[PDB]
Amino acid sequence: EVETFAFQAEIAQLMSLIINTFYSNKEIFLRELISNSSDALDKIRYESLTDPSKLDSGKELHINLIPNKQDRTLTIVDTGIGMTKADLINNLGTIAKSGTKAFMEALQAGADISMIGQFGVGFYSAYLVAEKVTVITKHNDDEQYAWESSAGGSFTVRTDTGEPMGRGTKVILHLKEDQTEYLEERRIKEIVKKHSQFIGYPITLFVE
Ligand SMILES: CCCCn1c(Cc2cc(OC)ccc2OC)nc2c(N)nc(F)nc21
Numbered sequence: 001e002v003e004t005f006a007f008q009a010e011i012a013q014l015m016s017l018i019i020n021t022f023y024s025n026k027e028i029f030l031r032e033l034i035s036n037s038s039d040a041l042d043k044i045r046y047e048s049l050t051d052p053s054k055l056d057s058g059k060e061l062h063i064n065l066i067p068n069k070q071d072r073t074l075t076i077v078d079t080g081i082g083m084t085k086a087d088l089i090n091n092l093g094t095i096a097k098s099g100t101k102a103f104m105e106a107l108q109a110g111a112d113i114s115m116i117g118q119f120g121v122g123f124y125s126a127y128l129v130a131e132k133v134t135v136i137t138k139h140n141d142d143e144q145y146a147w148e149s150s151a152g153g154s155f156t157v158r159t160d161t162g163e164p165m166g167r168g169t170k171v172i173l174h175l176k177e178d179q180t181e182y183l184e185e186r187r188i189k190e191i192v193k194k195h196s197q198f199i200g201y202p203i204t205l206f207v208e
Pocket of ligand 1: 081
C-alpha cells in the first residue's frame with residue numbers, strides 16, 4: 001500500500017523556491033547527488049571497519065550514472081549505507097529544517113542556488129531538472145523502500161517490489177521536457193569532470 005505524507009512546511013517552501021526562481025546554472029544538481037552518494041559510501045565504509053558483516057549485502061563501494069532516453073530518466077546509483085523508513089518519513093525532514101532555514105536566509109546577503117550543499121539540503125536541487133524524483137534505497141537494518149515526489153507538497157513511501165538492490169540508494173530523475181541534455185553522454189562527462197572530478201569511489205557513466 002502507498003502511504004502519502006506532507007513535507008514539513010519549510011522543505012515544501014525550499015522545494016517551491018528551487019522550482020520557481022530563475023536560475024540557469026541547473027547542472028549543479030549532479031554534484032549534489034554525487035556528494036550525497038560519497039557521504040553514504042564513506043559511512044558504510046566507516047561502519048564495516050568494526051563490523052565486516054555490514055558488507056554481506058555487497059562489498060563494492062561505487063557510483064553508477066545511468067541515462068535512459070526511452071524512459072527520460074537519469075539514475076544515480078550508489079552502494080552506500082542506504083536509508084531506513086525512519087530516514088525517509090521523519091529523520092531526513094527533521095535535519096533538513098535547519099539547513100533549509102540557513103540556506104533560505106543566505107539567498108539574501110547575496111548567496112545563490114549553487115550553494116545549497118553547504119547547508120546539507122543539496123538533494124532538493126534534483127528539482128532544478130526533474131519533474132518527479134523517485135528514490136529506491138535499502139539499508140542493512142530494514143527493507144527496500146520506494147520514496148517519491150513530484151513536489152506539490154507531498155511525497156509517498158511504499159515497500160519496493162522492483163529488483164532487489166543489496167544495499168544502497170538509487171535516485172531516479174524523471175527529467176523535465178527541456179532538460180534532456182542530461183541524458184547525453186558528453187554533457188554528463190563534462191559535468192562530472194568540472195564539479196565531481198575528485199570523488200573517492202569509481203563513477204561509471206553507463207552509455208545507452
Ligand atoms: C541528508 C543526508 C542523508 C540523506 N541522503 C541523501 C540526501 C537526501 C535524500 C532524500 O531522499 C528521499 C531526501 C532528503 C535528502 O536530504 C535532505 N542522499 C543520500 C544517499 N544517496 N544515500 C544515503 F544513504 N543517504 C542520503
